[PDB]
Design a protein around this ligand. Structure first.
Ligand SMILES: [Zn+2]
Ligand SMILES: [Zn+2]
Length: 191
């Protein structure tokens, strides 16, 4: 059988509406992805529920330069101000939104923390076909700050089987399911 994939257009519209999507790369693996600026306690709580471990914030290179995250997971951050210990859904949502804020600088944050910033390659999935790049691409395509929030979904037995389970899971929560391959193809034709 061939499992249904959503259109990239639907994934982008979900991202814009502040919803999450699931992105597969036919290379490893599905990640849950939303735009970092759209982080809420409820969406972080949802991500935390299904994360294999880390919650990451893919960032455009220009953001990383501004934050001092040079090309040179050991960097973790929390928002310095307006949070508890940094681990709550609400705290992590604040941290994520701050990372997407076009005026944030290193000292708006503390180290160590509960969110992992990641540097996306310039050019996005056209340059490097990774989940990190896809997240930034989707946020930017949605008209948002070029900053995403990602996690690997807890898996673990078979290839065809992974995709079918992801499709059901997506549908139970109203999420779009796409591949990086389709994102590449869309971008290439719509850029
Ligand atoms: Zn990945
Ligand atoms: Zn739900």
């Amino acid at each position: 059988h061939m499992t249904r994939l959503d259109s990239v257009e639907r994934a982008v519209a979900d991202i814009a509406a502040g919803k999450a999507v699931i992105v597969i790369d036919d290379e490893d693996e599905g990640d849950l992805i939303f735009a970092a600026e759209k982080a809420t306690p409820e969406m972080v709580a949802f991500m935390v529920r299904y994360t294999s471990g880390y919650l990451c914030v893919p960032l455009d290179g220009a953001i990383c330069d501004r934050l001092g995250l040079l090309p040179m997971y050991t960097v973790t951050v929390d928002a310095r101000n307006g949070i508890g210990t940094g681990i709550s859904a609400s705290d992590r949502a604040t941290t994520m939104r701050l990372l997407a804020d076009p005026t944030s600088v290193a000292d708006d944050f503390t180290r160590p923390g509960h969110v992992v910033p990641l540097r996306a390659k310039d050019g996005g999935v056209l340059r490097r076909p990774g989940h990190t790049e896809a997240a930034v691409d989707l946020a930017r395509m949605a008209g948002l700050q070029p900053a995403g929030a990602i996690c690997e979904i807890v898996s673990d037995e078979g290839s065809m089987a992974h995709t079918d389970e992801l499709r059901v899971f997506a549908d139970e929560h109203g999420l779009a399911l796409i591949t990086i391959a389709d994102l590449i193809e869309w971008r290439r034709k719509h850029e």
